[PDB]
Structure formats: structure tokens, C-alpha cells
Design a protein around this ligand. Structure first.
Ligand code: BGC
Ligand code: BGC
Ligand code: K
Ligand code: K
Lengths: 822, 822
């Protein structure tokens, strides 16, 4: 069951009905200004930070969903409709929405008028541009009046939604019907006071009329679908004082049969220097210079099209670093287009703002942004470098870190908790990924403060030492890392014991003492502490590196001695020292995270995939049997059916959802990668297909959410809603799947001194070529793959056999031809 | 222009159209369970705390406003309509809503079916009951199906609105079609975990069908006005699993010509002891015992009626303490009914939850709850006593206090700022009003902790000494109290200097040092420091009292010497010692707060109203001339037209709104009482009329909000919206106008040892009788009033002339007849 299709040549998803199972969105912008845009034009835009500089208003949990966005009401002879279908819901003769890379087009046609709108954020601009084309598709002349509409937000979205007792009296606007390229409205709430910024909403023509007051435009007792002004056929020229500012312009157009007209609208974010905020000595009238310039840069359709083409070229350039040509078109569209596009979006948004995350409490996550770096470092290495510096600046001197930072200020906060003991090790992961990718060893010398404190700077390498030493100096009675508030699983809260309702487990005070340990952080420390040992040796720190290898070896042996349940890895020891994730308990017998992570770290790996005695194989077979479903692998089994006070948030979810028996997709690639490590390519690829957008498109009515991006959670087998996704777009699933498919399944993966070429994908992809740009040289990697279990590659390079699977990096400008036989 | 009228005999405001300027609400409940109910059935319900235990969901800033509430969709022959008008907006043949004391009735009739709903919260119950009467007003038999609807909230209203990434997976219900009294739906989100509470929505009949999933009942792409289930005419029997739980039952009705049927619906809040939460050993099925009991208590019309009658008797008893019979029916309905009812609501709700206050950030305000006591102590003194202990327990040992407390827990928080230096003295005000009303001197001996700390208890009197000593030990260089974060005016933030956008002025950190002083707090200290001295005297503390009256004299002298601008009182000195509220400045020349409060404290009062040399008279004349408008007295003049960094939030409002040139009604009664003190009753009464609901009903189209309650803010003369109110219901204006009218205009006011009878109302009310129950005796107070300027009363009591205007309190059971000549 499908509601659209991929168009690979156009790099677009084509939605051919308004009647999708859920609003399906795109993100516009890749730099500092972003828009959430549904296939019904719903959503909102913000500059840098969705909580603090939100330009336009959007209602989550509206009835119906997604009533509110950038609308264009058409009044043709008294009949009013919107080409986005919502909010008016007039019958359309034709409707299509295409979501592309950084832009979308939505086109609706009714009664001989076709209205197509291109929405995008241009490169280098803090603005959302709309190019609207109206065409008379009838055989007689048409006259229609077009009313644009956007509802402003009062910048601080939390305040906007809660503090009406103040903010119903502060809404301010200016209206400029006769500006230099057409008509503009200025939304300038609090520019009177501390804000140096305002929004503009303008059109490239002298508008017939305007509206800036929502209640006037919409009318008492009316929804957006029933707005009075478009039904009247003329603007009310309303000038807001408080209440709800909007931007709306009316333009009447007359079109002969076949004739079209373009109109260009811009929503822009402008700043002025404090000294130049005002046009007038009395400080009453905003300085419009930068808004006039912006509108000048988008006064013509030619300017729009040039900017859209520059954006297309930017995307071609980004996607030129890693591409695959295989016999599986679903695989190829994920690797070449969709998974990389999503990794840009997660890089920019972290978990902050989607149609599920509300752009309020969540900023840039310390763990989240590190995981997203793993799937982003090849796309724009300079920006990954900057992100590493920003994240490491929010770390404390003892190696612990703020769990997230505020995007606008880059300062850490505790708003979604403190003391997540996996956080410090993710910094080592992010840096190791970045150095392997770029060979930029010099980043280890970058001075980086602790908690943004001027003069506290130490080299970024020393931050990694603090991370490493934090785990070393925080192990429990089994030699396993103490878990703290939680590890990667935010709902495994072993120090909590909360009996007070409604207090967030994420922020609630934890109990000192106890002996609670995490098998997940143990594996994480084996995996990434090995990379820290390597960086130390490369830095000429021989003794630090020897010591680091020793501690890694200790923790590794502890996993096998104290972290093994018999047929799978234990999950943890709780506050009392009792095992969690043991077959000795009735529920939560096996938990997926240490199964994938321990095996990625090589723990329990035997002689080959057919070595039934190896703990890794036993562990992965137990995952397959106990956690496997057609939709992916669930987090634990059985799910908990009553509240387990000593485990925290996890048992508070009904079984089959989120952390209690949901398919929590971020941890599935760990098992995929683990499967590649033991030599079971076919099984690893199977798990990849079960959760991957292009493979799940044919069950779009089950998945419900966007068929072109990963989501955080698919309901698991214990849910009545099994198969149904929540929380699309913003998830570490995107980066980790890209890691899994690009580096482990397809097998092309940067190491410090050469490119590892190690396919392990099984027999469903028997022939493919990867084109990989790495360290300035292009590698054409032609793979002939039997897919036989445990079979690993041999290579020839430029006509000559090479030993093993690592190709030493060639000099920049080379074309290196690698022939791979598996 | 009116949209309804007062019905005095019924104690109701009758709304005769759905098409009001704004939603007009009532509050149901007076104990621990409260509903906000508009004349369109919109709003929500909560137990004790609107942030933490909110039963049902309501959207502020919805389009249209107030789409959402307790709906009953009637399907007659395929035609669907709701008697509340919204959300369907079908043409009704008749519509009326009556808001009463603790109940409302909303009736709509269409095509031969009349549907009346009585909504109320019964005494002693944590539930909202609706008795629905449907009548066939046609001459032929009718059939219809009625579908009830309410949307649940996930208890924590903040989480409900912002934390979808967790909470879309936690919604849980149970469905009981065949229970003891009829059908019931249980909303039990998080009862699996830490909540010992669930909600029930039931009806006293076996429903034909039900729905618990919003998306199924409403249908995809639909608003509530388009709900699919009522249109199809059959329930979908949906059982929610996450997403959006609701309660809906369908009931088929059949009616002969002229026949009616009653249906009783109950939304209830139930708790179980932890040990009895579950019906089953597996802990999956909630114990329904308390809900079954509740539903049996409201299984019949007879039970509903008995309970509504008990509620009516309760209100007649509450209102028997103070009433007036005069020549002015507008004055009488305010004093007798509406102002007292509003005082009950502000006592219960503080500033927490209205159609403007969102029931999230604001709990029970320390200042607000003390001002509310002034207008509530005569209603239920035992409940006032307890509130005093509650508030005083959140005070710190140094006499400063948390600015508010969380209603559920009674623990103070800083969520809306700290260090408001008027707060400590408001506690003296509250206790003095309480003791004058009740003669309960023993409250001063009650053990009360500081910040709820076990073992920190000291007598309540000692808390007052901490408050009094706080001001004494925190005066600035002119002998005036240091202002701290702000005084009563929350936007006068002299220690702020914020240049950072979107950091609340209320909570942002303040700068140490400086010399910022408040003339407001100086006047509050002179007024209430005198009360504290009298309490110390009655306790035999002659040293303490003598020293107290000394400091009162020093501050009074400081006001005259350093707080006087020439024709009015100064407002403040800023951080650098520069005067605020001086004719020397271009804007904010005169501010109303010290003019009212200084003169209330007797500061600057001369020989009589025509003593034109007296500072009090010059100050009051300046108020009249510079701040007077037809709608009330604005806060200051001119309003500030640019941001003044040294003054904090105040100049961030556009001129004419809130604290920047708005009519901030709470401060108007201070000027009214001031004018009574100086002997100008005619002017005091004029100001009272200008802001008083019964008098502004005839301009309902200008005031906009409820015509039967005070609001916090009416737009001032500098606003394009001059005359239009915001923030109705929840305001200190209610208590302080009750004080003004009952105690100063009408002149009947308790003092420690007798009842003062001192009318000062001017010639427009030439005779009236007050009936006042005080200390167990009833005083029948018959006034003949010339209104002569400055003329004050002489009294005869029970046939004998008495000296002065204070009647010593008579023994309990007495009827004391007081004859008053003015
Ligand atoms: O914190 C509540 C305070 O908020 C300020 O923004 C408003 O101007 C005040 O009227 C209000 O009392
Ligand atoms: O604070 C963010 C966290 O909130 C928890 O309630 C959820 O279960 C987690 O998946 C999410 O990461
Ligand atoms: K997590
Ligand atoms: K205030």
C-alpha cells in the first residue's frame, strides 16, 4: 500500500495524494535557517534554534493534524480553495507534492487554475522563499485573487505557547505596501526592547491589500479552512496591536487560457547592529535596509531559479563523496540519496525539532551529535570538525559532560538530565571517526575549554583523556563501568527508585550509592577505548597508550567473566548488584544493546560464523530468535508488564513501545555490524532491509510515517500497533545505518592510514561498484561477491595483488582502481 | 451593547447568543476539583493543581478559540449538531447559556429537539457532573443518537503539550460497557507506574457504543466540527493504544411529542491506596470500586438535583455574611453576588489557570494569596486560616519568601522569580485582615515552619516579626525599603539591566549592589507595619511595639522628605539613586501605586478634602488629571515609548497595555480607598463604577471579556485598543474592590475590637442598609447619606447615641441595629 513513489533521477519523493496516513515532512535549509515543511505546506521555520528564534507558529496535536502552515488561498469567482488541500479541503482535480533535497514543490489544481509552489531555503540566506506559478488550464479567461498567509510566532516558542498573560499585549508589526520590490510586512515583536532581529514576509509585486491580524483575516468562530478574508475576496488591511500577528498579501491576477504568472514570496530573518536598529532618531521605526536587500535578491523568478540550481549543485557535490551502483535499486537510492540527506538533517537538528520533537526542551545532544558525526564526517568534514569543538567545549574537567547544549548559545544545560555515563565515550567515537575520515590529526591540538570557560582551554586530545579516565575511575564491583543516570538507553535508570508521579525520570534526582553497572558502557569502552589507545600512541604517548590497552583488556575480560548470561550478554547489574537481562528473570530476559555492541567490539568472536560455541554467535542467535520481527529487532524480550521500580523509566511504557519492547532502531545497526563481524553478511543485510525506508515503502500504511527516512521507533511484536513508527527523521538510526551499509555491508571504510575494503553483505548483492573519495583521491571499487558465509575479500589494486584488505591511502588527485573478490 | 443580562433572583448571568466577543467562562468547584467552562462548553478540569493533575485537554490560542470541550453531538435523521453551537456551528432555533454559582446550564434546540445540559462540581466530590435533558418539542415521535465527547489530558499538562516523543506511546484506557450503573470509560495513563489515580467518564445508561481513540472518532483530516463517528451515526468502539485517548458514548434516544429524557454523565477523579490499585493479580486491570461508587452517587436525576440544591444552600450560606440593599441595583448585584463569587475563585485559583493564565508556570502566589485573603476572610474564615499557615510555611527564616508554591505539594518554588521585596509585608496584611474579621488571636500562636522544614517551627507571630524586620533591615540611603527584584509591580526591575533577548525579566538573574528603593514598599510598610505593631501590643510586647511604631514613623518621614516630587509621590530610586516617577523625566512622570498606597497609609493627609496644601490631595488630583480615563486609571503617564534598560520589563510593553500605561485594575481600589480617606466619597465611587463589571456591561462590545467579573488589565488611553480587557477572572482586583466597596465606600469594616461604620460614597447612593454578620452577631446597618463632601458618619445603636464610628463587638446571637447619619 503506497501514497507516492521515489523518483531517483530527480532525487525526490513524490507524494500523489493529500490523504497520507500522517503528515509527511521535508526539512529546508542546511546551514543556520531551517523549515519543517509537510506535504500540505504545514510546519514552521526558525533561525539556529527552534526554541529561541522561531519565526512562525505551528500547533502540535492540532485537530486535525497539521492545520497551519504557509497557505495560499485562491478565490476564483467566490470559490475559495488552497492548492495544499488543507486547510480548506476543497476537491482538487490534481494534487502532487514532491520533497527534494533542500526544496519541495506542492501543486494543486481546481476548476481550471493550477497553483504550483516551490519552497526552499537558499544557500547563504536566512529565509524561506516560495515561487508560486498560477496557470489557467481552462479554455476561457480566469480572474482570481491570491491571499498568502503565515502566522508568526513570538520568537521564544515556550513563551509563545504558555505566557499569554504577558504576550497577548506585545505583538507588533509594520506594513510597507509600497516597498522597493513590492509589498512587505514586518513582524517586530520585542524589537522595541532586547531583540536586534525581526521577520519580514514580502512579495515581489505591489499587493492589492494586506492583513497582519489573525482574528481579522480568519474571522470570529472560524478555522483556517473557513477564513473570512479570502471568502470576502478582499484583504481587510488589518494592522495588529497585540493578539496574533500574521503576514498576508492579496494579489488579483487575470490570465488568458494557457497563460501563467509567477509570484515570489519571502519569509526572512533579519538582524541589525544595535547602533543601526532604527530608521529614525526617536527609535520608533525599524531599519528596513537588510529586509529590502533580501527582497531585492529574490525579486525575479530568474533569481529564484539560479538559487535553486546552486542548491542542486551543492547537493550533487555533497553526494559525490560516497556512491554505489549495484543490482538493488532500493539499496542504491538509500546509499546515494536518502540516508545521506537524512544525516545532514540529523547533523543540523540533533533531536530538537520535528513533527514529534517539539523544538522546546531539546537542543544539540552530546551523545546524539557524536553519533550523528559517524554518518556525517564524509559529507562536510570542516563542519564536523567545528561540531566536535563545540561539543567538547561543553564537557567538564572530570570527563563528564552536559548532556546537550542550547543551539543558539552553544552552552550546555541539564534540561533533560545529567550524568549519562555513556556520554564521555561518544566523544572519543566522534573524534576517531573524524580523524579516520579526514587525516586531520591536527584537531587533537585544537584548544578546547571545559564548560565554555575562557582560559580553561586544553588540547582536544586531553578532553579525550578526561573521557577515557572517567570510565576507568568509575567501574563497579565486577570491573564494569558504573551506569550513572542511564547509559545509551535513557530509560535504564538504576539509581532512581521514583514513586512520585509525573516527575521526569530524565531529570529526577538520583540516589547516591549502590553498585549499578552497565554491560553496554563496558562494550563501548572496549570499542572506543581501543581508539583512544591508538590516538595516544600516535601522539608519542607510549606509556599512556600501554596503560590504556591494559584497561581496555581488563574491561573486555570483565564482560566475558561477569557479563555473560549463558546464551547472551547480561545487560547490567542493578543498584543491589543483581543481574539485569538474565534468563533467570521472567521479563527483560535479553536486551539487545550489549549483544550488538559487545560483538562490534570483538568480544566473544570465535573461529567463524559456523562456530556454534562462540559467545558472539550464541548471543546473535538469541537476538535472532527472541528479538526478531518482520519490522526489525525489539529492544528486550519479554517486555515488562508491571512497573519495576529498580529499573526506572523503561517499564512505564506499555509493552511493544519505545524502550519497553519497541524496535528502537538506533540499536539495530549495532546488531547488523556485529553480524558482519562474525561473518554472516546475509543475516546482517536482512536486518538492514527490515528497518530501511526504501524496503518498507510497500507497507506505507503500516509504517504510517515518511517512507524515505528512518524513524526512532517502530512498534514491536508485543504492541497492538506492531509495525507502526513514531518519531521520524530525528534519530541516531540515520547515522548508524549509514555506517552499517556504507562501511560494513558494502564494506568501504576509512581507517587511520588506509581505506579498508571488506564487503560482508551476503548473496543478495552479488555485484556492485562503490565510488569513494577519501583523502583527496577517488577509489573505484569493483566488487564481485559470492556472499558465502564467512568469505572475506581479497584485493588487487591498479593491476597488482595486495596483502589483506587495507589499501594505503593514495596521493590526492589519484584514481585508484580496486578489484574486490569475495 | 449586551450579549446577555444578569438574573439577580437566580444569581446567574444569562448569555443569549453563542456569538460573544470572546469565550466567557465560569468556574465549577470551590474545594479541590475545578472546571473551567465557557458558554460553548469549552475548557477543562483538574484536581488540586492545573499543571500536575489536569484530567482533560484544552488548547489555548486555538483557531477558532475554544474549539474543544464537553460536547454532545446529536444526530437527528443524519443531521449532526451540538447544543453548545461550537464545534459544529449548526443553526439553532434557540440557544442560551446560564452561568451560576458553581454550575452552568447551556441549552440549544434544533429541528424539534431541545438539549439542555447542567454542568457542576458537586460538594464533597472530585467530579464534573452533567445532567442532560433532551426534549421532543415537535408534534411527532422523534429518534436521535447522542454521542458524548471529552478529550483526556495526560495529567501533567506541560508534558502533555511538549513531550510527544515519549507520551504518544503511553495513553491507556479501559472500557466497561456493562458496569453497575451504565457504561464507563477509564483513562489510566501512567497508573501502570507511579500514579495511584485514574479518570472515569461514564453515563447512567448502557451505551449503544463507545470510542476511546480520538483519531477514530474524529476521522483523519477532520476538525471536531466535522467528527466522523457522529456523522456516520454509529460509534466505532475504538480502544486506544497511545495517541489521543478520549471518552465518548453513543446513546440512542426515542421521544414522544413533548417527552423528555435525562441522561447523567460524570467525569471523575479517583484514587486507590497503593495496595488496592488492581482488580487482578497480574496488575493489568484497575480497581474500579471508587468509580463504581461515584457513578452510583450520580445514577439518577434525583441525586443530581439534591446535590445542585445542596450547592445552592451552600452559596446562600456563604453570601449571608455581607449584603446590601441600596437604590443602585448594579452596586447591589456586585456586592451581593458577583464580587463575592469572584473572591472565592481567586482564593482557590490564585493566578494559576484561566483562559489567559495557562495553568503551567503559576501556582499559589505569596503576594496574590495574601491580597486574595483580604476579600475572602469573611466568606470562610477557617479556610482562610489554613491558607495563612500554608503561605507562611513557604517563608524563609530571614523573612523573605518563595514568591509562590506548587498547589499539589504546598512547597515554594522560584519558577516565576524570587526576591520580590513587597512579599514579606503582604503576610502581615493577610493576618491582620484575618484577625480583624474573626477575633482568632490564637492563630498567632500556631507553630509554623520556615520552607516546610521539620523542626523549624516558630509561632506565626514570629513569622510576622521576620517580615517586619526584613523591611527594617533592608532600607536604602533615603530610608526607603530596597526594592529587590520588583515590588507589587512585577515589571519595575531596577536591578536587572538585561540586554539578552527572551530571558524572562521575572526570573533572569539580578545585579548585586546599587541603591534601588521603592516608594511603594515604604507606603506598604507604613500601612502594615502599624498593624504588626498593634498585634505586638495585644501580645504584651511593649518593647517590640514601641520600636515598631518608631520605624513606621521613620519611613513615613522618609516618604515625605525623599518620596515627594511636588505634586505627587515619587515611585522609586533606581540602581544609581536616580528618581523614578518624577516630573523631571519626559515619560513615566507619575505612577499610580504610591499615590493610592501612601494615602491609604495616611501619608500627606491634611485638614480635609479641600485642604489644597495637603500632599495627599495634590497627589490624588494629579492622578485624576494625568491617569484618569473613562475606563479607569492608567498605571503611569506618559507611557514609555523606548526601552529603558534601567527599569526592566516595564517599557517592553507597547504603550497602553499591562504595566506600561494599561489600566492595571488591582491598583485602582487603592486610589478609591485613598479618596475615601481624604473625604471625597463622590470621586471614590466614580472610580469604582469605571472598572466595575455591572457598570461596564452596557459596553460589552468594548470590554470584550466576561461582563460579570473583574479582569487584570483594561487597555489604557495610549492603546489603539483603549477599553478592551485581557486576563479576566484571576486578579487581585477582585479582593481589593471588595475591600473598597464593602469596607470603605459602604463603610462597614471590621477592626480588632469593634465594627467601624464609616460610609464615604458620595450623593449617588443616598440610602442603603448593610446586613453584616461579625463575630457571631448580626448588625443591621441603616444609612441615610447626604454625600456631602467630607461629611462622615454619626451613629446611634439600639436607640442610643454612641461616640465615634466604631461599634464595640456585641455578643454572638445579638441583632444590633445601627442607625447611620452622614
Ligand atoms: O510572572 C507573572 C508576571 O509576568 C509579567 O510578565 C507581567 O507583566 C506581570 O503582570 C505578571 O504578574
Ligand atoms: O529526554 C529524552 C528521552 O526521553 C525519554 O522519555 C524517552 O523514553 C527517550 O527515548 C528519550 O531519549
Ligand atoms: K537514547
Ligand atoms: K503584580
Amino acid at each position: 500500500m503506497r501514497y507516492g513513489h521515489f523518483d531517483d533521477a530527480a532525487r525526490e519523493y513524490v507524494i500523489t495524494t493529500p490523504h497520507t496516513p500522517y503528515p509527511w515532512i521535508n526539512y529546508l535549509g542546511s546551514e543556520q535557517f531551517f523549515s519543517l515543511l509537510s506535504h500540505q505546506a504545514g510546519g514552521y521555520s526558525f533561525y539556529r534554534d527552534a526554541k529561541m528564534r522561531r519565526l512562525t507558529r505551528y500547533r502540535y496535536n492540532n485537530i486535525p493534524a497539521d492545520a497551519g502552515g504557509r497557505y495560499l488561498y485562491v478565490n476564483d469567482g467566490g470559490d475559495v480553495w488552497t492548492p495544499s488541500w488543507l486547510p480548506v479541503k476543497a476537491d482538487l482535480d490534481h494534487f502532487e507534492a514532491r520533497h527534494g533535497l533542500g526544496y519541495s514543490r506542492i501543486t494543486g489544481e481546481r476548476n481550471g487554475l493550477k497553483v504550483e509552489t516551490l519552497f526552499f531555503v537558499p544557500l547563504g540566506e536566512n529565509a524561506e522563499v516560495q515561487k508560486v506559478t498560477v496557470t489557467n488550464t481552462s479554455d476561457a479567461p480566469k480572474t482570481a485573487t491570491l491571499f498568502s498567509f503565515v502566522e508568526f510566532c513570538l520568537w521564544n516558542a515556550q513563551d509563545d505557547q504558555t505566557n499569554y498573560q504577558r504576550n497577548l499585549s506585545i505583538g507588533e508589526v509594520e506594513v510597507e505596501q509600497d516597498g522597493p520590490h513590492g509589498s512587505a510586512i514586518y513582524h517586530k515583536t520585542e524589537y522595541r526592547e532586547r531583540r536586534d532581529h525581526y521577520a519580514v514576509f514580502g512579495v515581489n509585486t505591489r499587493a492589492d491589500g494586506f492583513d497582519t491580524d489573525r482574528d481579522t483575516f480568519v474571522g470570529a468562530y472560524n478555522s483556517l479552512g473557513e477564513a473570512s478574508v479570502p471568502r470576502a475576496g478582499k484583504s481587510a488591511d488589518s494592522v495588529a496591536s497585540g493578539w496574533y500577528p500574521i503576514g498576508s498579501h492579496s494579489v488579483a491576477v487575470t490570465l488568458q487560457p494557457g497563460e501563467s504568472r509567477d509570484l515570489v514570496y519571502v519569509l526572512g530573518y533579519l538582524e541589525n547592529p544595535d547602533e543601526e536598529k532604527w530608521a529614525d532618531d526617536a527609535h520608533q521605526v525599524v531599519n528596513k535596509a537588510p529586509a529590502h536587500a533580501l527582497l531585492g535578491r529574490f525579486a525575479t523568478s530568474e533569481q529564484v531559479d539560479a538559487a535553486l540550481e546552486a542548491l542542486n549543485s551543492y547537493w550533487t557535490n555533497l553526494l559525490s563523496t560516497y556512491s554505489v551502483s549495484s543490482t538493488d535499486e532500493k539499496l542504491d537510492r538509500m546509499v546515494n540519496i536518502w540516508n545521506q540527506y537524512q544525516c545532514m538533517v540529523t547533523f543540523n537538528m540533533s533531536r530538537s525539532a520535528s513533527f514529534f520533537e517539539t523544538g522546546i526542551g531539546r537542543g544539540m545532544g552530546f551523545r546524539d551529535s557524536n553519533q550523528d558525526l559517524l554518518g556525517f564526517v564524509h559529507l562536510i568534514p570542516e563542519r564536523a570538525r567545528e561540531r566536535i569543538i563545540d561539543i567538547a567545549s561543553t564537557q567538564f574537567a572530570d570527563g563528564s559532560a552536559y548532556h546537550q547544549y542550547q543551539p543558539l548559545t552553544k552552552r550546555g544545560n541539564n534540561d533533560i538530565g545529567s550524568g549519562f555515563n555513556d556520554d564521555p565515550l561518544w566523544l572519543i567515537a566522534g573524534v576517531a571517526a573524524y580523524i579516520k575520515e579526514s587525516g586531520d590529526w591536527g584537531i587533537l591540538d585544537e584548544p578546547v575549554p571545559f564548560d565554555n570557560e575562557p582560559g580553561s582551554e586544553v588540547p582536544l586530545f586531553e578532553h579525550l583523556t578526561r573521557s577515557f579516565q572517567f570510565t576507568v575511575q568509575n567501574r563497579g564491583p565486577h570491573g564494569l563501568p558504573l551506569i550513572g543516570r542511564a547509559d545509551w538507553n535513557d530509560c535504564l535508570n538504576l539509581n532512581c527508585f521514583s514513586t512520585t508521579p509525573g516527575e521526569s525520570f530524565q531529570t529526577t534526582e538520583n540516589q547516591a550509592g549502590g553498585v549499578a553497572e552497565s554491560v553496554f558502557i563496558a562494550a563501548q569502552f572496549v570499542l572506543y577505548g581501543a581508539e583512544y589507545a591508538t590516538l595516544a600512541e600516535r601522539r608519542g604517548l607510549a606509556d599512556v597508550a600501554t596503560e590504556a590497552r591494559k584497561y581496555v583488556d581488563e574491561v573486555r575480560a570483565a564482560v566475558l567473566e561477569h557479563g555473560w548470561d549463558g546464551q547472551w550478554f547480561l545487560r547490567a547489574y542493578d543498584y543491589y548488584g543483581n543481574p539485569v537481562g538474565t534468563d533467570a528473570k521472567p521479563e527483560g530476559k535479553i536486551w539487545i544493546e550489549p549483544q550488538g555492541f559487545a560483538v562490534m567490539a570483538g568480544i566473544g568472536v570465535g573461529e567463524g560464523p559456523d562456530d556454534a560455541d562462540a559467545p558472539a554467535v550464541k548471543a546473535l542467535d538469541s537476538v535472532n530468535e527472541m528479538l526478531g520481527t518482520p519490522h526489525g529487532l525489539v529492544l528486550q524480550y519479554p517486555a515488562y508488564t508491571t512497573y519495576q521500580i529498580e529499573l526506572g523509566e523503561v517499564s512505564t511504557y506499555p509493552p511493544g513501545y519505545k524502550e519497553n519492547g519497541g524496535i528502537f532502531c538506533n540499536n539495530n545497526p549495532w546488531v547488523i555490524i556485529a553480524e558482519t563481524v562474525v561473518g554472516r553478511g546475509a543475516q546482517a543485510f536482512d536486518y538492514y532491509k527490515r528497518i530501511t525506508p526504501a524496503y518498507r515503502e510497500d507497507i506505507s500504511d503500516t509504517h504510517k510515517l515518511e517512507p524515505y527516512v528512518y524513524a526512532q521507533m517502530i512498534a514491536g511484536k508485543e504492541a497492538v500497533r506492531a509495525g507502526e513508527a513514531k518519531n521520524s527523521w530525528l534519530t541516531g538510526t540515520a547515522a548508524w545505518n549509514f555506517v552499517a551499509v556504507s562501511q560494513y555491508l558494502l564494506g568501504v571504510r576509512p581507517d587511520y592510514d588506509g581505506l579498508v575494503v571488506d564487503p560482508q553483505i551476503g548473496p543478495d548483492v552479488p555485484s556492485y561498484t562503490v565510488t569513494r573519495v577519501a583523502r583527496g583521491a577517488t577509489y573505484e571499487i569493483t566488487v564481485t561477491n559470492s556472499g558465502a558465509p564467512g568469505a572475506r575479500a581479497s584485493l588487487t589494486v591498479d593491476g597488482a595483488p595486495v596483502d589483506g584488505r587495507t589499501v594505503p591511502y593514495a596521493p590526492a588527485g589519484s584514481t585508484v582502481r580496486v578489484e574486490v573478490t569475495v
